[PDB]
Amino acid sequence: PDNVMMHEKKDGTLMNEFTTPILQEVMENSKIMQLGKYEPMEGTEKKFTFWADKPGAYWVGEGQKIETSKATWVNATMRAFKLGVILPVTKEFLNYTYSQFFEEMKPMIAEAFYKKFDEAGILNQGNNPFGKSIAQSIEKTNKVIKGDFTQDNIIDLEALLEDDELEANAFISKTQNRSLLRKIVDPETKERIYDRNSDSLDGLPVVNLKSSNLKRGELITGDFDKLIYGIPQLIEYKIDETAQLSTVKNEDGTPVNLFEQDMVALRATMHVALHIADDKAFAK
Amino acid sequence: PDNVMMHEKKDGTLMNEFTTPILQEVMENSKIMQLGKYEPMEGTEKKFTFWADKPGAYWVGEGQKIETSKATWVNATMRAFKLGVILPVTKEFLNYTYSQFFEEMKPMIAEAFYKKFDEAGILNQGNNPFGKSIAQSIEKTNKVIKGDFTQDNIIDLEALLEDDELEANAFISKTQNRSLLRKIVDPETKERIYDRNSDSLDGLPVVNLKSSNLKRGELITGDFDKLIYGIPQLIEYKIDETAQLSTVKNEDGTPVNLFEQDMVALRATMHVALHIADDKAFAK
């Protein structure tokens, strides 16, 4: 029914023509999406990990391997406030039409979705964890290295991960950490590890995690599952927002302050093969 | 005969309409396929070589050349658990068989299968060799240099097969090895060899091997025939395996642990010219 034409619909369910564009804008910004692997889901589901192989009838022995099961779920709320200011009333939505409202929000809602998933996915910082983060797997299996940035330590980190079979892949390190990666040079073999032009640490690519969680550290992965799908939805109302903060004092009374907010309900889900390592600071 | 309408076809042979698409996906994935040729054949192919010399009419003084025949064969298999985990969704297959079934699983079975080829192709770690090519070709014709990274050594690396009347085509070097390629600069002629934009060493494209079986090595190729034949051939049983473990250790009793498994039996074949140069490392 809905397309362009009009917009005087406060509540509803978002049409899939505009949904997958919104998810397409979340796509690149989320670091765990780039590093992870994707297999399709509808609400609740179970999958099995790893890869299988044979050499035919020639050689029966060798090539032993493991299978493991896990169930996928959990919901993540999104409450918007910027929207309320840029558009006074719902007749203005109508004047734009149904299409352009979501095109205006296309960056805004997408920015906050990837921001929270990465904060609650790579670490357990926010209030939207559920299973086990990358940090949580490292809390189980003591894979800690002391705060020193040398060619031996990066090779040791990869070797430590390699020691339990699985080979290393892309790196997660914050933007401030990029400055320390510049000056890692050996005297005998005069070559720098970190390539400045193409963002890659030891050949493998890096992602600059825009968050205030890490300080001086490096993370790696390879084998990780992270596909999510349902429907975002839209609910427009004016109430006392609990998890937001007006100006700098107290909770935002919307009928008092005169805004028109919007909600997006998306689902968030993660499955991990539990063997990852972290490098952290020592101080003294 | 076969159509989208109906499923419940457990044991069968694929149509050429779907066989070519699934192969197309496995071609770009591979390393040896990207650096190799394709002669057609049915079961086994007889090849032969050499140019010979012949007189115009008179004398026929000191004319003596030879020629020899060759052979190619061998089959490879894989046992996927992933389609058996999907198997619960009977409505999926019943509603849209083949088209939607094989499209969903193009990575699921080809991704594992291509890595097995590369294990026995570029290395000989895999237990499905036939010609036992690259590893043994180095052992047969000792064309190895003591591993240090300079242009002079890269020229020497190419010179080994240039010496035996064979032109260089393309390189094989790791993603981790990419970092050491940047520091190659000559003292007199200040020019860079490796280009940042395109993964190529010289006028010669590089393929990055993901299988962790190289330290600091480079391999030249360009005289190989990778050959895929027959049909992938799908079977769908729900029974106990031999080469498998179910989570703890015990054999995956598929009737108890209610899964299914899809079998894929494609054909895999190679052939060699026996003139390849290899590099490694100096002391350590």
């Binding site: 997958t20 780039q34 590093l35 994707y38 892949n169 596909l227 | -």
Partner: peptide, 16 residues
């Protein structure tokens, strides 16, 4: 969700 997973595989930093 299938079309999302297809584009997700395409736009990925690590090559498959």
């Amino acid at each position: 969700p299938q079309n999302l997973a297809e584009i997700a595989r395409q736009k990925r930093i690590i090559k498959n």
